[PDB]
Design a protein around this ligand. Sequence first.
Ligand SMILES: OC[C@H]1C[C@@H](Nc2ncnc3cccc(OCc4ccccc4)c23)[C@H](O)[C@@H]1O
Lengths: 378, 115
Amino acid sequence: GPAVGIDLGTTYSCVGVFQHGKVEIIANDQGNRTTPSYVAFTDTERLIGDAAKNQVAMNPTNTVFDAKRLIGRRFDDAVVQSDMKHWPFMVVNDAGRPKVQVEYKGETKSFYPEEVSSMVLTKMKEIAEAYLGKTVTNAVVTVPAYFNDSQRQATKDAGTIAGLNVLRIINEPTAAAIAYGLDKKVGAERNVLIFDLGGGTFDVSILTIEDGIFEVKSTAGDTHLGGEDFDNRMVNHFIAEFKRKHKKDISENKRAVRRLRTACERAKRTLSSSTQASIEIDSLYEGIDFYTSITRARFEELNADLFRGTLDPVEKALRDAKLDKSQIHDIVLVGGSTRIPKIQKLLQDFFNGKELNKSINPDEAVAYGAAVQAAILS
Amino acid sequence: GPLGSNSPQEEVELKKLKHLEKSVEKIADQLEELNKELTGIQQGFLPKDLQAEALCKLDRRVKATIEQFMKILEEIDTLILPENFKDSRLKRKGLVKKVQAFLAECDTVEQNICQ
Ligand SMILES: OC[C@H]1C[C@@H](Nc2ncnc3cccc(OCc4ccccc4)c23)[C@H](O)[C@@H]1O
């Protein structure tokens, strides 16, 4: 069995393997290249990945996600205190350490974040084994560049609890750079900017690479920013349109808002490759059919502040790395939301028409680079 | 649109809707089985505490039924049917209305138990 690369993300994880001279991102049991970093506890069983995310509406309190926001942190950490408000599941204080509390097989149980993360890692390991038809033990697991010793060690502990031999832990922007082979370019020191907008987080990192030594010069970003916010702006737009056309407010009907939100997320994806998207929803609210459309330009206006806002972190990281924007040799796009043409346009224009590294699937680049490193260490 | 201009392309949409109609019938059967179980609990000899446990197990099952019907609606919501596909549009509207009537029945169960 070969060594795999695993990207353990806040909301989605990805596993890849290097075989036959190429990197293969492995599809899970449901055929998805990425798997939700979700663990659900029910009266009869424990569910992980797509199975856990698929029952979130049914069992919100007992479905855990975002363990990565808690891993390696103290309970009193500002991030733990702020993030708790947004979670439907309980977070308790076990002697200074946070634990997630759930109902599992009719009993109140608590788990450390590395235990929740080990369950997600077990799933990623199993996904690899199902594809390869061979036992998988060795893996390279990625972490954010801003993770401290506690957070890195807790991620390694999650790997160990999952039965993995964690060969190496590497930073997510280093993995992304490796996928594009930016360390293999001949010349002087290279300044790389990694623009990561995926899974509900926004991370900007500047790295300097020289003779294969990756130096993290600066990190910046927004802890809570992503596709969900862009979908929300389209939902607001549609709710307002429904009020204008029918003089009815669908906002308090959770099912109507959900059908609209699901359609918006889909329309947003269409808007990354088409300039218009249409939506048809029969009997949305009070028996009224809602047939409408949205242009890419309107989607961009609804999200103008959020899209433009992504450059502030870039400016902050450049100032912290003591670099002018013209000193950046390479720009790498990571995360699913970097597929948005307007975001790419804003970043290319800020870097004066410089071409972006975007050929590798954004959702897969971190796992791709980790799979490359896992092959080198085999 | 023209009269009696049924197209092969529409057949593809109608087949999608038929598969959704069959999935709705299966979910509906699950709802009828939940209804029978609820009656059984009510007419049974379970004492108060075991009756509550049995109604809450039934609650999780009614929440699963609601979710399945919601996923069907989300699937139907992916369809874009041209104005000329009159038969598909009629079938889509009728199926959504049928699912919404089953959802109202689920709601009568769900709000009457495990309060
Ligand atoms: O939590 C992950 C993000 C990534 C968003 N994906 C996309 N956003 C914009 N344009 C896209 C165009 C094509 C494909 C996309 O992502 C598909 C996808 C869906 C789920 C997980 C990963 C990727 C796009 C997705 O909607 C979600 O908000």
